[PDB]
Design a protein around this ligand. Structure first.
Ligand SMILES: CC(=O)Nc1cccc(-c2c(-c3ccccc3)oc3ncnc(N[C@H](CO)c4ccccc4)c23)c1
Ligand SMILES: CC(=O)Nc1cccc(-c2c(-c3ccccc3)oc3ncnc(N[C@H](CO)c4ccccc4)c23)c1
Lengths: 303, 303
């Protein structure tokens, strides 16, 4: 009927890995930094380890396993993959450590040393990842700079598949109900009708690029999420970032068309940003890449 | 008779420069970071500005002018030069700002990222500076890693001429009396007889190199200055730094010979360290330039 999912769900023993330190916490639970050491091999693998909490909510435990299902079912250099789970009191997700954290925080606390080459290359890698997920028939539903991680400054990957959904062969869209999805990153049709498609992800990709080009600005910074529906319907969109040529900003705008099919496909976004990456300073203007009358004392010879 | 010193002592107005911040303080007085802006030109020169204190000791005011005399009388890329003085309540010395501070502190707080190329190049530059001072008939009498400043990581200069003395044409050595000179950097003949020569500076150069090669260790760390005389007479010298090949350590040892003329001349030290700088990893072994079984998760494919 459909292609059987022959992904392997690896079950790992707790004694095989060591939590070095906590990385984060909040509503999602807690994430740890650690080393995984398979007993047989002579290897030590840096890993991130995620668990919920001391309590076990019926609905919440089910959803971490859904997240494991999707992460176990993906294999791509620009997508984060599940290494395994550990069946402790509460289930643990084990993944490759992405030491430099989320891309949102990275662009924020490195503004001054991020060049056009890096920005446009990140855009290419995210598009490649999203394109892979489209081939795999997966709709992410939560693509944002915050859900892209940095393995190295020159290599990023998409993660956070907690809202992701797999589409059938004879199925073009997913219909949500529960809601509670980040509104400022989702397409109008998703806000209006709970419709999610690969083209809905393209909208979110558009917003993600805006975040990168503004070095981590909050979209619609002074606007509550209730109003977002109205302003999009009016034709209002995120503004052109200072560093963005009309060339780049036109790409971003096309991702936010009302007609979903009029938006570009991820495969096209790979091409366009890739072309731009060959001559990056032609497409992004960044003053790096408090006075200009300053001169060093030994280029000032005594008159 | 002797060559007339036609150096120009430039007198600068206080209104021409602005103190941005204090850099240091202690027994020597205070040093400021500032901008010098000659009224005529369209330039802004980063400068260090040194003054004594609110009080004016007769003997202390004279000595800052002696320091100005020598700094005004030197012109070399590896020596710090006086830009001018300002005749305020207490006289101010104005020099080129050396933004990265003293080399001693620089090797200490950058151990992990200082390679053999940088160390040996610094040795070449200091020897060039000291050789220039020898041609200029000047004995520094206080050469140490602390009295070498960093303009950029790849360009250093000798400074702190407060103890410096000019020798005559028919004069090979200076005879001190007052004393109170840093004992752990001075030659045995200087400790024993108050004799200072260009070869006494070579001893101090030797110690300065030891500081650099140990990334800013204190010489004779657990020894009081009273004992230093004895141990040098016994034949005890500073130990071989871990990173130092016998080749480099032999240079250091030769600077600490009892016979002053058996020590190398600065011009020879330029040559030897310069040769070594062409193949720096042959002469200094540094592990950069907590596990080795570590492997990244995507070079570990699921068995
Ligand atoms: C959205 C968010 O805050 N994600 C997050 C939170 C906490 C840690 C990480 C994380 C980091 C990280 C490292 C240093 C500083 C800050 C963050 O590195 C990571 N490498 C892999 N996965 C990470 N976290 C995701 C959470 O989406 C994750 C962990 C384990 C299993 C699945 C996913 C991570 C990522
Ligand atoms: C031995 C010592 O502590 N020297 C010292 C003390 C304070 C400041 C400086 C100094 C610095 C500096 C900058 C940032 C951090 C730390 C130090 O930069 C400098 N550039 C030029 N001269 C300096 N000081 C010498 C004092 O020997 C100096 C200043 C003005 C006139 C003559 C000499 C300096 C150097």
């Amino acid at each position: 009927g459909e292609a059987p999912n022959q992904a392997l769900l690896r079950i790992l023993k707790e004694t095989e890995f060591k939590k070095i330190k906590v990385l984060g916490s909040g509503a999602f639970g807690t994430v740890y930094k650690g080393l995984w050491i398979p007993e047989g091999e002579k290897v030590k693998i840096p890993v991130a380890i995620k668990e919920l909490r001391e309590a076990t909510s019926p609905k919440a435990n089910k959803e971490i396993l859904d997240e494991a299902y999707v992460m176990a079912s993906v294999d791509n250099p620009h997508v984060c993959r599940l290494l395994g789970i550990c069946l402790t009191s509460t289930v643990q997700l084990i993944t490759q450590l992405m030491p430099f954290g989320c891309l949102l925080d990275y662009v924020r606390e490195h503004k001054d040393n991020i060049g056009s080459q890096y920005l446009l290359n990140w855009c290419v890698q995210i598009a490649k990842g999203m394109n892979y997920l489209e081939d795999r028939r997966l709709v992410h539903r939560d693509l944002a700079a915050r859900n892209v991680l940095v393995k190295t400054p020159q290599h990023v990957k998409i993660t956070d598949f907690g809202l992701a959904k797999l589409l059938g062969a004879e199925e073009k869209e997913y219909h949500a109900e529960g809601g509670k999805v980040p509104i400022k990153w989702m397409a109008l049709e998703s806000i209006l009708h709970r419709i999610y498609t690969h083209q809905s992800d393209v909208w979110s990709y558009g917003v993600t690029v805006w975040e990168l080009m503004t070095f981590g600005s909050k979209p619609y910074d002074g606007i509550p999420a209730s109003e977002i529906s109205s302003i999009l319907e009016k034709g209002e969109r995120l503004p052109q970032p200072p560093i963005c040529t009309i060339d780049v900003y036109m790409i971003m705008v096309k991702c936010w068309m009302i007609d979903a099919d009029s938006r570009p496909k991820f495969r096209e976004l790979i091409i366009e940003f890739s072309k731009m990456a060959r001559d990056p300073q032609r497409y992004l203007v960044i003053q790096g890449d408090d006075m200009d009358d300053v001169v060093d004392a030994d280029e000032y010879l005594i008159p």
